[PDB]
Design a protein around this ligand. Sequence first.
Ligand SMILES: Cc1ccc(NC(=O)c2ccc(CN3CCN(C)CC3)cc2)cc1Nc1nccc(-c2cccnc2)n1
Ligand SMILES: [Cl-]
Length: 287
Amino acid sequence: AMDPSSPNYDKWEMERTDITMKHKLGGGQYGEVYEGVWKKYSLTVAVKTLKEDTMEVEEFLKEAAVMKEIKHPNLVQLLGVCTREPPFYIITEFMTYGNLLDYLRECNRQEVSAVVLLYMATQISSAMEYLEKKNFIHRDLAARNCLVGENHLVKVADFGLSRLMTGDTYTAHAGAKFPIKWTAPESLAYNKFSIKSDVWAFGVLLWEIATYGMSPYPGIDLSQVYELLEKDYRMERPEGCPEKVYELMRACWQWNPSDRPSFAEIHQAFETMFQESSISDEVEKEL
Ligand SMILES: Cc1ccc(NC(=O)c2ccc(CN3CCN(C)CC3)cc2)cc1Nc1nccc(-c2cccnc2)n1
Ligand SMILES: [Cl-]
């Protein structure tokens, strides 16, 4: 596939010996993803590989194919693949600060101020606006699936955490493992996923951002979440959150999917949200 004249030529295919494989990334909270070094550039990269004899070879190849079709500053950047023969690799850039959820929980709040949180939320909506217009659905948007780079740059990723994750984030539901607290009602009850269920998840992600990474619906048992949501319960405006930001969360959590804003509308909302007063002024007024 590396031969220019070949009808099977793929500019993404690269020589895997160009990469030095290091240890598994983030301990193992990403599964078979390893830190690697692209020798020629002395560049640290992230390398996703396939688990020992699994039946997700087609899903792996499908993911590689989809990544070749997307290019956006806020989506993890594909650097190359090694899929001509085993072992299959998907290589992407390495993001210095790791996942957004841990970053929010461990950051210097003086640096990562309300302005920066808004910037992070806006960048995420930009990536989703892109996927939206290209007719893609994310299906598992949450802070744990976003990465943070230099200067608070945020990129939306998809680590296929469903089964890798430990703890209560993902629980048994509809024959699969669902991160219930980020799942839209129609997804929970009718297994219907769409860009609108991503919007509902984005609203939960916005709440994660606004609380520096608190876990949603704290103290509520998952077995009562649907009934509560059906009777219009929603997490209250969190401490210090600007009213306008909370209104956007509420819009994302409309019961009817069709009533939720598009990501294009969400991104625009962010860009013009604080034209009469700054978010800093609102976070003071609120407190
Ligand atoms: C090495 C790799 C291989 C594949 C991917 N893939 C994606 O991140 C991704 C994002 C969006 C889509 C779009 N897709 C559309 C269809 N729907 C259903 C799912 C989403 C697909 C793949 C990322 C990576 N990068 C990655 N993976 C795990 C951890 C890290 C990582 C960790 C710490 C610091 N820097 C990087 N980096
Ligand atoms: Cl899709």
